[model samples]
Target: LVMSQSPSSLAVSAGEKVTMSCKSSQSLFNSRTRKNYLAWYQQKPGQSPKLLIYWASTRESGVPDRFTGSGSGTDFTLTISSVQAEDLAVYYCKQSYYHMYTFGSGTKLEIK
Candidate 1:
């Protein structure tokens, strides 16, 4: 599990794409599937939260392929391409290996 905070914020321009990285020292282990259990979530500026991706690259129900995930073991990347106005939000990476769960530093999508 990780509790991360950035001193200097990372910025992104409106139409430009970006990738947020989540990392762990030891290889993550999943209790349920006995594999590297991973996931991503998004929290819009002032709306209820939602799941984006899970288990490496499986997009949740209706998420667009524009939101992609790739990586394994201890390294992962969550990418957002051609950001839309609705993409403004705080994104997080989660690992279910610990059973209790883990999340990387919440990344706020910026459009300036």
Candidate 2:
């Protein structure tokens, strides 16, 4: 299954909160384990991609509190509270349940 992101382009001002959405072609959650197999990444212009959230809504170590992840099954959201200039970048969602991984189309956040 593939993952896709919505609102391909997003514009927000500093201190504003923005919500990015992701959807999977099929359910990536395991009913037996009660867990979703999803993750998120942030990429800057010239920097390597960084893992922000993983295991559905669990934040990776060193991720700021402003970034929050939520959702279940095939739907997920990555919310950035009080957006800042540094937050301007491309965000992607990925699924890790199967042997092959799929990444979202990506959402670019613009600081207005």
Candidate 3:
């Protein structure tokens, strides 16, 4: 199944909240553990993809607190509480359940 995101592109000024949604074709939650196996990444021009959040809502170590992950199962959300110039990049959500290793098309964050 293909996982995807909404509003392929988002334009927001610095200090504004940038929110994007990620949808999975099927439920990604583990009934036994009650955890959603999802991860969010950031990819900047000429740089490798950086893991921002994983396991649904946990922010990765060293990642700014402003970047957050939320929601679960088929619907998930990635939010940047206060956007900044350096935050200009493409964000992607990927599923890690069962090692499918699929990612959303990506949402481009642009400074306005």
Candidate 3 residue pairs in backbone clash:
none
The lDDT, on a scale of 0 to 1, for candidate 2 is 0.92
- Candidate 2 off by > 4 Å: none
Q: Where is model 3 poorest over a 10-residue stretch in terms of lDDT?
A: 94-103
Model 1: lDDT of residue 43: 88
Q: How would you order the candidates by lDDT, starting with the best?
A: 2, 3, 1
RMSD of 1: 2.7
Better of 1 and 2 by lDDT: 2
Candidate 2 lDDT tens digits, 18-83: 999999989889989888999999999989989999987999998998999999888999999999
**Higher-TM-score candidate among 2 and 3?**
2
TM-score for each candidate, following the candidate numbering? 0.82, 0.96, 0.95
Give me the candidate number with maximum lDDT: 2
- Candidate 1 ranges beyond 4 A from true positions: 3-8, 29-34
Clashes of each: 0, 0, 0
lDDT of 3 at 104: 93
Off by over 4 Å in 3: none
lDDT per residue, candidate 3, 33-97, as tens digits?
88899899999987999999999899988999999899988999998988999999999999999
